[PDB]
Design a binder for these strands. Structure first.
Ligand SMILES: [Mg+2]
Ligand SMILES: [Mg+2]
Ligand SMILES: [Mg+2]
Ligand SMILES: [Mg+2]
Length: 1298
RNA sequence: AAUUUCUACUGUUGUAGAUGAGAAGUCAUUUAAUAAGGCCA
DNA sequence: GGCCTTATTAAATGACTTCTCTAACGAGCTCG
DNA sequence: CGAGCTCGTTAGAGAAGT
């Protein structure tokens, strides 16, 4: 089993705890004000990360725009990029790695050739030194305040007179930023990290520009349509300026053209953010002010030719927009809307609109309401001619169809039955071989279908109706007579909300977005949608000024000096509905769990004894209780070597901590020091090895020297030379190494570990209890208690894991050989109060339970039970890192150790396998090493202890609440915590099965192209069961198992590779194999049949060729069902060997019919056998003899016959069915090669799948079962072939039992 | 309806499982409004 | 009355990929 | 005008890898 597989690689956690202020430390903290001046150092510290990240926005516009013109190296990259995608053994990446790095070393040459890069990451930024004004407060002071710039106009920072004060108040707090200046050494890294601006250009925006021009010279090919470069280039001209061409020299302000935009030499203008919001506006498009329509772009002009002209494959020249530049305040060029700030807008902006609608009198003396009851009433008495009245055949007409007529296809199929008889004769002049498109035939797409073409065409529509009183023109004509009644539903609903537009008329309230207004937003929202939906019923008469070539439609008489004057006021629900929707939908700002300083920039950066007057944080132990003492700033030497001797008594075991961090960085820090090199005495040759870097393979040389070779002829150099004195330091003589010895020791990596593996000492020194209480009462120590609900007295049973780790830091089983090394840089926090004090369950009165299996219905409870006591209290927290498996950290070549484990521990290893999705969120199936499954249950109902709750319906209830919250502007409730708490039940249920049944759990692949658009489902546990199973078998401790035994707390299970990324993961994360998607669910389990046919009814003549390919299509005399018994060798794409005998004995099912419109409303049911006997009754083909009846089927040609028999073959092949109840939708197998009795999974035994989704996990665990067959026979061909192609997969499934 | 935190609980000032935190950056998605379009037994 | 496409804007959530898990020396400093 | 003092800084291996 997995029992020799503990202590494999180091890890890290962060144990959280509460800190209870003991004694009068809470009296001392709140006396000075060490929390009231600490929410002013996380609210006034994130301001100084928005001032330093705005000096990086006047350095990232100088490292990419003003310099960095990487010319003609681009073509050397582009030649080896497109060539690389075809085929590559080992050569095409040699030039590709060279062409990648050579572009980077010109971007990262202005890294080390600028003045603003050394004085950017240290003290010289904020406050440099006495006598020097520092480069960030110099950049802000004279260049901005005395210059002309106001660039703090978009923040919570007011101006720049105030923004110097945030920076200057961190004087002395420069090492507080040492984790922020390591996130700005990542923006400029010349390495393969995605935070870098040299990865954003070379590995994001450049290959997304090579394929962005390879899909444009293939767009001049195959498609020269009317893309914008015919006349329409007044639109995208302000974003085609490009003040310097990069095929030639400078050109002042000429408008570029699309030929010299996708030139490879002009990528060097697509570097900064001002030239990516000037390239995505090419591809995307933009809106303007005083607009009529949209200014389109190349990925929109391809849409209007792809679908509008033909049936298409031109969608796949969809050109990507380029990713933004790191740290960049992006621009739009697309009219961002003037978003509002508080609640005094939403009841004044919304209030001033309906003041202007209901109380507007024109210069022609009318109102908006009494000129649709007066002007659309003139449509009844025909006072206006019905030919200058125009609909708009895009959607407002077809929306008017199934609003008046209860059918969409009335006005559509009444001009269809009018254009074929009136404007066209019965001569049938070119029906198909003509235009039939938007140019000559569809003259009403962009143009306006007249009501004169509706008046005497609906009158012609009723000439062939069934009943007499049917749909005709005066029902359309009287709807718009009833449209100014919605004018009276608004402005009476607005007078209805006169009492809730006054409970929010106060500036800066910001309360409509609270959940206390969740039922009053509903009154504000549904007053907008009585105006939004009103102005989709006047979007039928709208003349959009997009005038075509002299095709001015004649329409003037009292219908557009009237309608477009009153539609012009009511069209302001573009700037009313979105200034409000974007304000309500935002979450309200919760309070912060800010970080505790106690006036110390290095608070608990280290626990070491030598640094405690600098760190000021000590740990204690008193009777299995743990204590956090934080010394005062002023009184920091109150635990020195003197005060422990004068107070050595009985009580708090104070913790003595010894640490040697970074033996690469530390042993040549003190030995080769510029203070005490004379004491360690390096020889004449050691002092140049640290210069020439001979002791390293790839280590840096000291300045002014050159890297020599590690192991040319001196691999045995450092053994007898570079090993001098660790046992001469005053403190560090505690090690006892496994010294070099010329035979027993490799390179300098294996010494700097054995320093750090042994450079950790934890010892205990008693302090008398009367002294600790004396400094706490005085003000010289802030003692807290590290409290975790298992350190309480009432802890009956098993504790947590983040308690059973913390007890195991300070143990004595631990410190014999350290597994649980405590770390530094721990954080202290203070979460304020969130939930109010409402008791809701008072004393001693009974409370009804929530379990029907529970042999109890009430509970007494002498004490109260407030709702959330976590959040009714102002708490102190303590995030504390650990470094589990400390002296073992080999995290490399992990997966070959498992593939050598499973090569020996085969025939005893089972295959867990999980299907994600919606019908089952997960579905394990413990398939053993022969196929015959053992356990099988959904992970929908989980928690087998005493509850058995159903999270599949809990998560679906959040989806239907989240999606309702988005569409009702309610608060979107976070589904990730319910899903984290659901999966914790699953993972533990997995983790028990991994050890009890020896699993090698295998998922479906789900390439990231799938799961991006599978985020439509919100209950789906894609990416999330696997990420919470890799990091949960990285360290798998069993609370039942004995402390220091195999799966215990010291020795715990490590069964995944260390989770670095998914990118360098592949298809083996330890034991978490992946298998690729497709053809897992649709397979008969007992035989192995698949859906390798695809009838679609393309033509009629080749349909005769389709049903001639079968071997025989016969009725069975002996039993009574049809057969389509064939072989697949006589078919097109990929022949799978096997003679299939598919049948129609099983009664198949649901075909997904459609009631009024399409896309999966309802279901059906049809039997296959009794559907084609009807078809052998409609035609003269008989079947009583029982032989080959193939030739009779191919003879009788019909439009009906070969469009129906394929649609029955698209139903016998449909195996996943069995709706109408949605109760474990089973499978029917056609072939059944065993005895002819089919596989119907309702009547399935224990060791077969039970529904359709149990057949996915039976085959994810079956293509993942031949992974375990390769590994069982794997050898010196170490190229581990985990990728499978379904040519042997289909071979292995079918030939299983044999 | 009690938690370092989350989920389910009453298991009785708690019970069972899980818990890698901080910071920075980006990306993906959903919904809505808008724009131009396509299709339907 | 539905479904889908290409975009743009705004709001949300979810989730990826990087850095760190540090004691000791040396300026730089106030003080004498 | 050197005493320590005290915070910003400095020291700077090594291996696998859609
Ligand atoms: Mg440039
Ligand atoms: Mg316990
Ligand atoms: Mg527990
Ligand atoms: Mg709960």
């Amino acid at each position: 089993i997995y029992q020799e597989f503990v202590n494999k690689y180091s890890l890290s956690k962060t144990l959280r705890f509460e800190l209870i202020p003991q004694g009068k430390t809470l009296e001392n903290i709140k006396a000075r004000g060490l929390i009231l001046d600490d929410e002013k150092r996380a609210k006034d510290y994130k301001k100084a990360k928005q001032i330093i990240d705005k000096y990086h926005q006047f350095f990232i516009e100088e490292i990419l725009s003003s310099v960095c013109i990487s010319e003609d190296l681009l073509q050397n990259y582009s030649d080896v990029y497109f060539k690389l995608k075809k085929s590559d053994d080992d050569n095409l990446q040699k030039d590709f790695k060279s062409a990648k790095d050579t572009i980077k070393k010109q971007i990262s040459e202005y890294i080390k050739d600028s003045e603003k890069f050394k004085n950017l990451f240290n003290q010289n930024l904020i406050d440099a030194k006495k006598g020097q004004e520092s480069d960030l407060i110099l950049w802000l002071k004279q260049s901005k305040d005395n210059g002309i710039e106001l660039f703090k106009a978009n923040s919570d920072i007011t101006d720049i007179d105030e923004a110097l004060e945030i920076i200057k108040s961190f004087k002395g707090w420069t090492t507080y930023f040492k984790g922020f200046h390591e996130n700005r050494k990542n923006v400029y890294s010349s390495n393969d990290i995605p935070t870098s601006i040299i990865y954003r250009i070379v590995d994001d925006n450049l290959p997304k520009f090579l394929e962005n021009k390879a899909k444009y010279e293939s767009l001049k090919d195959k498609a020269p349509e009317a893309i914008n470069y015919e006349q329409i280039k007044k639109d995208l001209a302000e974003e085609l300026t490009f003040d310097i061409d990069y095929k030639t020299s400078e050109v002042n302000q000429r408008v570029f053209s699309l030929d010299e935009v996708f030139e490879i030499a002009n990528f060097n203008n697509y570097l900064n953010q001002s030239g990516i919001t000037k390239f995505n506006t090419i591809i995307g498009g933009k809106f303007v002010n005083g607009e009529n329509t949209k200014r389109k772009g190349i990925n929109e002009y391809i849409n209007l030719y792809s679908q509008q002209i033909n049936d298409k494959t031109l969608k796949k020249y969809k050109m990507s927009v380029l990713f933004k530049q790191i740290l960049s305040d992006t621009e739009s060029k697309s009219f961002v809307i003037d978003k509002l700030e508080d609640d005094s807008d939403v009841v004044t902006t919304m209030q001033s609109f309906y003041e202007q609608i209901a109380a507007f009198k024109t210069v022609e003396e009318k109102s908006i309401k009494e000129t649709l009851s007066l002007l659309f009433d003139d449509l009844k008495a025909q006072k206006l001619d019905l030919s200058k009245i125009y609909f708009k055949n895009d959607k407002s007409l077809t929306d008017l169809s199934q609003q008046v007529f209860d059918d969409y296809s009335v006005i559509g199929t009444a001009v269809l039955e009018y254009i074929t008889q009136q404007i066209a004769p019965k001569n049938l002049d070119n029906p198909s071989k003509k235009e039939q498109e938007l140019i000559a035939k569809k003259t009403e797409k962009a143009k306006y279908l007249s009501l004169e073409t509706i008046k005497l065409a609906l009158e012609e529509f009723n000439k062939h109706r069934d009943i007499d009183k049917q749909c005709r023109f005066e029902e359309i004509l009287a709807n718009f007579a009833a449209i100014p009644m919605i004018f009276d539903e608004i402005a009476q609903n607005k007078d209805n909300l006169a009492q809730i537009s006054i409970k929010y008329q106060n500036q800066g309230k910001k309360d409509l977005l609270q959940a206390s207004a969740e039922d009053d937003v509903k009154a504000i929202k549904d007053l907008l949608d009585q105006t939004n939906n009103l102005l989709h019923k006047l979007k039928i008469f709208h003349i959009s000024q997009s005038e075509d070539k002299a095709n001015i439609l004649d329409k003037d008489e009292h219908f557009y000096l009237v309608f477009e004057e009153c539609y012009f006021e009511l069209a302001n629900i573009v700037p009313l509905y979105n200034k409000i929707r974007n304000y309500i939908t935002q979450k309200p700002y919760s309070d912060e769990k800010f970080k505790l300083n106690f006036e110390n920039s290095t608070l608990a950066n280290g626990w070491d004894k030598n640094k405690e007057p600098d760190n000021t944080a000590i740990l204690f132990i008193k009777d299995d209780k743990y204590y956090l003492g934080v010394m005062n700033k002023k009184n920091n030497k109150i635990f020195d070597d003197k005060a422990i001797k004068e107070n050595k008594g009985e009580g708090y075991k104070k913790i003595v901590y010894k640490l040697l961090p970074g033996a690469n960085k530390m042993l040549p820090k003190v030995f080769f020091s510029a203070k005490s090199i004379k004491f360690y005495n390096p020889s004449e040759d050691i002092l140049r090895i640290r210069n020439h870097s001979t002791h390293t393979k790839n280590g840096s040389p000291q300045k002014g020297y050159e890297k020599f070779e590690f192991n040319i002829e001196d691999c045995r150099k450092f053994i007898d030379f570079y090993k001098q004195s660790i046992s001469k330091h005053p403190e560090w003589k505690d090690f006892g190494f496994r010294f070099s010895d010329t035979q027993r020791y490799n390179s300098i990596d294996e010494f700097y570990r054995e320093v750090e593996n042994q450079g950790y000492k934890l010892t205990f020194e008693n302090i008398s209890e009367s002294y600790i209480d004396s400094v706490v009462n005085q003000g010289k120590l802030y003692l807290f208690q590290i409290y975790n609900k298992d350190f309480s007295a009432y802890s009956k049973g098993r504790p947590n894991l983040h308690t059973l780790y913390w007890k195991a830091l300070f143990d004595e089983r631990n410190l014999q050989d350290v597994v649980y090394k405590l770390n530094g840089e721990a954080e202290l926090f203070y979460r304020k109060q969130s939930i109010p004090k409402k008791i809701t369950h008072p004393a001693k009165e009974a409370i009804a339970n929530k379990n029907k299996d529970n042999p109890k219905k009430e509970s007494v409870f002498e004490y109260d039970l407030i709702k959330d006591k976590r959040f009714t209290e102002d708490k102190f927290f303590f995030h504390c890192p650990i470094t589990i498996n400390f002296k073992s950290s080999g995290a490399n070549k992990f997966n070959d150790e498992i593939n050598l484990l499973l090569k020996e521990k085969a025939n005893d290893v089972h295959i867990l396998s999980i299907d994600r999705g919606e019908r089952h969120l997960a579905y394990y199936t413990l398939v053993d090493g022969k196929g015959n499954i053992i356990k099988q249950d959904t992970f929908n109902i989980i928690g087998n202890d005493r509850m058995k709750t159903n999270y599949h319906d809990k998560l679906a209830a959040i989806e239907k609440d989240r999606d309702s919250a988005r569409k009702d502007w309610k608060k979107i409730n976070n589904i990730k915590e319910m899903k984290e708490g659901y999966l914790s039940q699953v993972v533990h249920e997995i983790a028990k099965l991994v050890i009890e049944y020896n699993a090698i759990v295998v998922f479906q692949d789900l390439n990231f192209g799938f799961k991006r658009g599978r985020f439509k489902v919100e209950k789906q546990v894609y990416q999330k069961l696997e990420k919470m199973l890799i990091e949960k078998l990285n360290y798998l401790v069993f609370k039942d198992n004995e402390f220091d035994k195999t799966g215990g707390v010291l020795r715990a299970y490590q069964l995944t590779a260390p989770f670095e990324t998914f990118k360098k993961m592949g298809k083996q994360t330890g034991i978490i194999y992946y298998v690729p998607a497709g053809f897992t669910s649709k397979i008969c389990p007992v035989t192995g049949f698949v859906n390798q046919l695809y009838p679609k009814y393309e033509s009629v003549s080749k349909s005769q060729e389709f049903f001639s390919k079968f071997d025989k299509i016969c009725y069975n005399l002996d039993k009574g069902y049809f057969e389509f018994s064939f072989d697949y060798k006589n078919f097109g794409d990929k022949a799978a060997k096997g003679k299939w005998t598919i049948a129609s004995f099983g009664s198949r099912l649901i075909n997904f019919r459609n009631s009024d419109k399409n896309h999966n409303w309802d279901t059906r049911e049809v039997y296959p056998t009794k559907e084609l006997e009807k078809l052998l009754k409609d035609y003269s083909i008989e079947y009583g003899h029982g032989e080959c009846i193939k030739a009779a089927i191919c003879g009788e040609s019909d439009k009906k016959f070969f469009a129906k028999l394929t649609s029955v073959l698209n139903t016998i092949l449909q195996m996943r069915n069995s709706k109408t109840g949605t109760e474990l939708d089973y499978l029917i197998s056609p072939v059944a090669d065993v005895n002819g009795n089919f596989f119907d999974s309702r009547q399935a035994p224990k060791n077969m799948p039970q529904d359709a989704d149990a057949n996915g996990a039976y085959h994810i665990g079956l293509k993942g079962l031949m992974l375990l067959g390769r590994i069982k026979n794997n050898q010196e061909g170490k190229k581990l072939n985990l990728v499978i192609k379904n040519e042997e997969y289909f071979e292995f499934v079918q030939n299983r039992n044999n």
